[PDB]
Design a protein around this ligand. Structure first.
Ligand SMILES: CCCCCCCC/C=C\CCCCCCCC(=O)O[C@@H](COC(=O)CCCCCCCCCCCCCCC)COP(=O)([O-])OCC[N+](C)(C)C
Ligand SMILES: CCCCCCCC/C=C/CCCCCCCC(=O)OC[C@H](O)CO
Ligand SMILES: CCCCCCCC/C=C/CCCCCCCC(=O)OC[C@H](O)CO
Ligand SMILES: CCCCCCCC/C=C\CCCCCCCC(=O)OC[C@H](O)CO
Ligand SMILES: CCCCCCCCCCCCCCCC(=O)O
Ligand SMILES: CCCCCCCCCCCCCCCC(=O)O
Lengths: 96, 98, 177, 95, 219, 49, 40
């Protein structure tokens, strides 16, 4: 019924899982520690759920195009040395 | 294999043709044969035969695979709890004065 | 009401053991749509043999090829050798054996606790086996009556464990009097 | 063997001729050298009369149609990009 | 938000946790913990729904069981809410041939109708077998008639027409082009066999092609 | 205390605001009512957020 | 010569940097609690 080391650990774990308490501090110092741990828990668990929602929402909605190839130079690119592909590029009037 | 991809749309649209020397006698029969093979579906069968028949690379809810780890932890914790309880019970049962 | 409790626990142990053994031996765990012995047709795949139906040569079937990042290797190994369903079968067997031996060498009232522990552990092994099975299947479908025989074996095993622990508690309560 | 080997046999049956497959010597499709103005590849073989017909993935282009004849297309296509290229983790709930 | 297997294994884990908490809480005669099997089940249910506790295990082992159940509950309920937030925030082809609820047809006289009447491809021959015998007729006298039939049939009519016309996708109000093209072909300027205009018009089409006129006009 | 009408209204309101309990039903019938109310609260509050 | 011969330039997870403040508040509260207990 009082905060020994094992009961202190149980209170902290239960406060983190938002799983209620069978006992809470009664003194000013115990209540300062409890309140600050409750704040830390609220921010951390809200942030876990918010970031998991962000992960799933973004997942629900490195070259993707010729424009991509044209704008970069880390990735080399070419064609058959003799072919209609090489001629397509040698004569294209399209900017990209 | 090793199946290691086509990206983006096609840059243009065109076709492959059977070619003959300018003025060749074969030009008309071969043009008509290509159209006959087209209309009878031969060209689709042959592309499927050589591209896909022998191809070597061929939901929204949350699946149990996404959370299986939490189930493994839960059952491991239940096992550990049973072991701790039995260890303490054996200790107490052996700690009676004899 | 002691006496009928012993019959109920013995019947439950035998039922759980039979259901889990049938589930492991039988192969109607998953109604997938794949290839029978080496056209895509339905299949009553199981823990060992992916078996065919509604096909050109239905009824002819083979041994699933489990194998084609150590985590995937470990999971594929644990699901290839049904260690968890088989361990569930063994633990249910040993639990039943303890319950049976609870008539001979009576007055120990400490082996019936071992029966409760075996039944609870069998349930836990069974649930791990279901999780690894479903996880490895993710490498349309449905689940067959073998899957539900395994699940029902889990439920009956947990109830029989609760009864065994209740009987052990009652026995020490009588002894303490 | 191949798509064009299968197609060659069928074109030859439907046109009523016997044929001999030959691989283009320079292994090229066909381009007019800007400089020597000579046509190489399969197009050159037809232009200079070394071959009577080309049955290959030879693209119908204006510059080629000016010097050789093409049937209607037996395959439709376009230039594309080829690039060198998931199971969730067990403890992925910590991500 | 959660797959059927997750719900099923949640129920199995609930039964297992309740039974192991009951076993560990009250099995040793030296403990004789108000966790009977009924109270163990109540504690586990109220822990899962993140509701009041009213009793908490006091032993080391009952506390291990309680702690792992609390962690499991936090992860599973957080993920249910996150995936529901994801859900709330944000005929394909052969498909026509394999079904009958959605009717489909072509222009009553066209190259499309002839494509199907002569196809030797199984899916298209199956579609032709259906379309030529469908009653009421699935064929339409004009493209506009086909478009209106799609628009008024509540999704029960799909229309087969050339990709170019399928233009309608950019017109007010409700239609969409689905899947790839069933074939590949071209529109040409036609003249009577042996017409004097044939050569100049063939060359003009190539000139208009090369100078970009045909792309400007389609755009 | 036990669940009179005022205490039962308080229990239900506290359950909906996810604000834990001072009392909880002890009988099978009370616990069925409490369980379905807890499930309803969880789905409705998750869906609101 | 003048451009390149003389060239002089040759949904992630959440990090401890955007929750650090709450850790600082937590440890400050623990220090304040220890001070209040010792004063009493
Ligand atoms: C105090 C309270 C007590 C708490 C008690 C805590 C207990 C902790 C138990 C955790 C079990 C770990 C199992 C495991 O390693 O999973 C393996 C799967 O392989 C399997 O399929 C696992 C087999 C069933 C595990 C049975 C228990 C994979 O795991 P990994 O390779 O380690 O993961 C790293 C790579 N990965 C993330 C991509 C997968
Ligand atoms: C007195 C209190 C009694 C004790 C109460 C116990 C309950 C708390 C357990 C929490 C889960 C712990 C397990 C966390 C999972 C660890 C897995 C992990 O670290 O994964 C590694 C990963 O692969 C990258 O390295
Ligand atoms: C110890 C006292 C016990 C207290 C008991 C409290 C009950 C708590 C749970 C209620 C929800 C359970 C009902 C869930 C119904 C699921 C609906 C369903 O079955 O899904 C339909 C179908 O599968 C898809 O189309
Ligand atoms: C009855 C006894 C209870 C005892 C009390 C328990 C503690 C209360 C809980 C949390 C305190 C949180 C403190 C928040 C600190 C805010 C820091 C801040 O605002 O700094 C940001 C800055 O203003 C931007 O520029
Ligand atoms: C890390 C946290 C510290 C771990 C415990 C250290 C051991 C100190 C002796 C405590 C003995 C148990 C007494 C009690 O239950 O209050
Ligand atoms: C803590 C234990 C009970 C919690 C409530 C869990 C609800 C169980 C539902 C099980 C069946 C779910 C069926 C969904 C799949 C489907 O819609 O096809």
């Amino acid at each position: 019924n009082e905060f020994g080391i094992f009961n202190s650990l149980w209170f902290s774990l239960g406060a983190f899982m938002r799983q209620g308490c069978d006992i809470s501090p009664r003194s000013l110092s115990g209540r300062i520690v409890g309140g600050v741990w409750w704040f830390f828990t609220l921010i951390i668990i809200s942030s876990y759920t918010a970031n998991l929602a962000a992960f799933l929402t973004v997942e629900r909605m490195p070259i993707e195009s010729a424009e991509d190839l044209s704008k970069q130079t880390e990735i080399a690119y070419g064609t058959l040395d003799s072919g209609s592909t090489k001629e397509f590029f040698r004569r294209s009037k399209i900017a990209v | 294999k090793p199946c290691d991809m086509k990206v983006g749309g096609n840059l243009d649209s065109k076709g492959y043709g059977i070619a003959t020397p300018k003025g060749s006698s074969l030009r008309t029969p071969v043009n008509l044969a290509v159209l006959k093979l087209s209309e009878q579906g031969v060209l689709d069968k042959l592309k499927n035969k050589w591209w896909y028949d022998k191809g070597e690379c061929g939901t929204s809810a949350l699946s149990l695979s996404n959370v299986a780890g939490v189930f493994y932890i839960l059952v491991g914790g239940l096992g550990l709890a049973m072991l701790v309880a039995l260890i303490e019970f054996c200790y107490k049962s052996r700690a009676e004065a004899k | 009401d002691r006496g009928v409790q012993m019959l109920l626990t013995t019947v439950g142990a035998f039922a759980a053991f039979s259901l889990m053994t049938i589930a492991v031996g039988t192969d109607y765990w998953l109604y997938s749509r794949g290839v029978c012995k080496t056209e895509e047709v339905m299949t009553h795949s199981g823990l060992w043999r992916t078996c065919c139906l509604e096909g050109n040569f239905k009824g002819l079937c083979k041994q699933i090829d489990h194998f084609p990042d150590t985590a995937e290797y470990f999971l594929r190994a644990v699901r290839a050798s049904s260690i968890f369903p088989i361990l569930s079968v063994i633990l249910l067997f040993m639990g039943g054996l303890c319950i049976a031996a609870s008539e001979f060498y009576k007055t120990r009232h400490n082996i019936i606790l071992s029966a409760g522990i075996f039944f609870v552990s069998a349930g836990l092994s069974n649930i791990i086996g279901i999780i690894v099975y479903i996880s490895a299947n993710a490498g349309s479908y449905s689940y067959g009556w073998s899957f539900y025989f395994g699940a029902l074996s889990f439920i009956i095993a947990e109830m029989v464990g609760v009864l065994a622990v209740h009987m052990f508690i009652d026995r020490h309560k009588q002894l303490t009097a | 063997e191949g798509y064009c080997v299968d197609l060659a046999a069928e074109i030859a049956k439907h046109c009523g001729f016997k044929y001999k497959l030959t691989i283009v010597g320079d292994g090229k499709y066909g381009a007019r050298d800007a400089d020597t103005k000579i046509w190489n590849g399969m197009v050159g073989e037809l232009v200079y009369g070394k071959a009577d017909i080309a049955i290959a993935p030879l693209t119908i282009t204006l510059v080629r149609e000016e010097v050789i004849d093409f049937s209607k297309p037996f395959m439709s296509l376009g230039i594309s990009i080829m690039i060198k290229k998931s199971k969730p983790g067990v403890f992925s709930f910590l991500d | 938000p959660l797959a059927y297997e997750i719900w099923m294994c949640i129920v199995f884990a609930y039964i297992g946790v309740s039974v192991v908490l009951f076993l560990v809480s009250r099995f040793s005669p030296y403990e004789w913990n108000e966790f009977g099997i009924f109270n163990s089940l109540w504690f586990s249910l109220g822990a899962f729904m993140r509701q009041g506790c009213d009793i908490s295990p006091r032993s080391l082992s009952g506390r291990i069981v309680g702690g792992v159940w609390w962690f499991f509950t936090l992860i599973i309920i957080s993920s249910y809410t996150a995936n529901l937030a994801a859900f709330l925030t944000v005929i394909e082809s052969e498909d026509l041939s394999k079904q009958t609820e959605i009717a489909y047809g072509t222009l009553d006289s066209g190259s499309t109708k002839e494509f199907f009447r002569r196809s030797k491809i199984a899916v298209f021959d199956k579609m032709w077998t259906y379309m030529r015998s469908a009653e009421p007729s699935v064929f339409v006298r004009t493209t506009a008639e086909g478009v209106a039939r799609v628009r008024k049939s509540k999704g029960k009519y799909a229309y087969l027409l050339e990709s170019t016309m399928n233009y309608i996708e950019q017109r007010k109000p409700d239609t969409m082009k689905v899947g790839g093209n069933l074939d590949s072909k071209g529109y040409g300027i036609a003249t009577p066999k042996g017409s004097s205009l044939r050569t100049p018009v063939n060359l003009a089409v190539l000139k208009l092609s090369e100078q970009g006129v045909l792309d400007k006009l389609k755009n």
